[PDB]
Design a protein around this ligand. Structure first.
Ligand SMILES: O=c1[nH]sc2cc(F)ccc12
Ligand SMILES: O=c1[nH]sc2cc(F)ccc12
Lengths: 141, 142
């Protein structure tokens, strides 16, 4: 059963607007300068990069807890997502995704094992498996 | 193919933390919604995914309409309302669900349905999640 559901209205594509129905997310969008736009507002790739970095970091927190070896706080987890858009060779586009994951205060080996476990848990990682090959680098700070 | 555009976003502290693009343009705080034991202060990964996919899909609808060469449209004649949910799967795990309501102004119902079916082949979010999330879509004209 559905634990949480949300609606967002988008009008006018990549030059237009988004507004969540509850008003909490309300943003103008622009084409980036690389595509000839002004780049003075966000875009689908940035919104996706943000959703996935946040969800993945959250799931890393949950996996590190319950493994029950380390006593970590929220901000000991940073995820830097790189999301790109490319033509797919079949008249459409694909995303590319890279994640740099930085965990504070745990060993390199444990951090890598935690990130591997998290990739099986995170809803977004499971949403793209078999279509996008996500690449990941793990850092320990 | 070479990448047409790439962007970076740093997220700290999971669903109760923050996001910020490396160019400063997108910078937001996040909160668990009340349904998941939070305040709802602020946006969240499902709302951000919903927004990106509704906007990308609307843009592809525009592109497909224009490449089919029949209709005169402006950008704001396309609207996408996405519903994104998070459900329990498997063994205490979680999955995403997506429904799209697509509304095209000024075109016929059968043409709008053909356009929306073609845009699912173009939009990179649809291509990204195919076979993992079973997207449902309803098409309206007005
Ligand atoms: O991102 C997540 N991974 S574990 C989890 C549990 C929730 F209840 C909501 C989100 C997440
Ligand atoms: O969503 C899209 N469908 S057509 C297109 C062309 C672009 F250059 C960037 C995004 C899109």
């Amino acid at each position: 059963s559905t634990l949480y559901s949300t609606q967002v209205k988008a009008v006018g594509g990549r030059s237009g607007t988004i507004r969540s129905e509850d008003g909490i997310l309300e943003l103008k969008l622009a084409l980036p300068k690389e595509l000839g736009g002004k780049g003075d507002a966000t875009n689908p790739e940035q919104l996706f990069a943000a959703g996935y970095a946040a969800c993945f970091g959250n799931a890393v927190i949950h996996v590190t807890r319950s493994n029950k070896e380390y006593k970590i706080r929220d901000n000991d987890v940073e995820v830097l997502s790189t999301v790109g858009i490319v033509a797919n060779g079949n008249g459409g586009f694909a995303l590319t995704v890279h994640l740099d994951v930085t965990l504070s205060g745990i060993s390199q080996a444990d951090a890598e094992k935690i990130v591997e476990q998290t990739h099986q848990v995170c809803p977004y990682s499971n949403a793209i498996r078999g279509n996008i090959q996500v690449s990941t680098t793990v850092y320990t700070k």
